[PDB]
Amino acid sequence: GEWEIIDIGPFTQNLGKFAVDEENKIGQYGRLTFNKVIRPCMKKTIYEIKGYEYQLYVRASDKLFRADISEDYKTRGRKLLRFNGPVPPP
Amino acid sequence: GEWEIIDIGPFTQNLGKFAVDEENKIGQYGRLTFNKVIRPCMKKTIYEEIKGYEYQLYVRASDKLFRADISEDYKTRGRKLLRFNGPVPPP
């Protein structure tokens, strides 16, 4: 499935917010406050198109994390696949 | 420095060979046998003129997947294995 690099405008920032909101619900890390998504952000398209996956570098509570998020083309449902950190700056 | 996705041709495969050979020198894993670098491969171009590059790789070695970050200084050709961690899940 093709890969590409996407910019870090408000669409992508909302993806980072989704990651932190979802992580906060799970409660593995405890309370994170979302700051910003930083570059690079990668998007995988799975084929029409079945859906997508986003790999993000998310700044939350003054630290950096990796989150992976999937999106279904047909239903538009989103899910936080993975979230770990802190990781060193790219 | 800007990021981009690069090919997985011989230049890139040789980066994965470098990674596995360097990792094998530390010997924290049992002996790893390089299989292939898989997509996606990312490159960051570092400016002071381009001073150098950093590469984030997904390397198949001994039928598992490893993430390896590599730097290289253009002038000296200094290639350095910054990290190697694994196994990780398929991208």
| Residue ranges of domains in chain A, CATH in brackets | 1-90 (3.10.450.10)
In this structure, is the dihedral angle defined by the CA atoms of residues B25, B80, B19 and A67, taken in order, positive or negative? positive
* Chain A 46-65, residues with CB within 8 Å of chain B CB atoms: 55
Residue A42 to residue B42, Cβ atoms within 8 A: yes
Beta-carbon neighbour count of residue B70 at 10 Å? 21
Dmax (CA) for chain B in angstroms is 40
> From B69, which residue of chain A is nearest by alpha-carbon distance?
A90
Give all strands of the β-sheet with A78-84 in edge-to-edge order.
A3-6, A34-46, A51-60, A63-72, A78-84
CA distance B27 to B88: 19
How far apart, in whole angstroms, are the C-alpha atoms of residue A56 and residue A63?
14
B88 touches chain A (CB under 8 A): no
Question: Chain A contacts of B40, Cβ < 8 Å?
Answer: 3, 42, 44
Per the CB < 8 A criterion, the answer to whether B22 and B84 are in contact is yes
| Method used to solve the structure | X-ray
**Residue-wise DSSP of A21-51:** HHHHHHTSS----EEEEEEEEEEEEE----E
B5 touching A (Cβ < 8 Å): yes
User: Pseudo-torsion of CA B57, B61, B64, B68, nearest 10°?
Assistant: -30
Resolution value in angstroms:
2.0
| Residue recorded with tokens 């994170």 | A32
State phi, psi for A58 to the nearest 5 degrees: -110, 120
Contact A51, A73 (CB under 8 A): yes
Q: Which residues of B touch A44 (CB under 8 A)?
A: 40, 91
Whole-angstrom distance, CA of residue B58 vs CA of residue B12: 10
C-alpha Rg value of chain B to the nearest Å: 13
Measure in Å the smallest separation between the Cα of A27 and chain B Cα atoms. Answer: 23
- The DSSP output letter for A17 is H
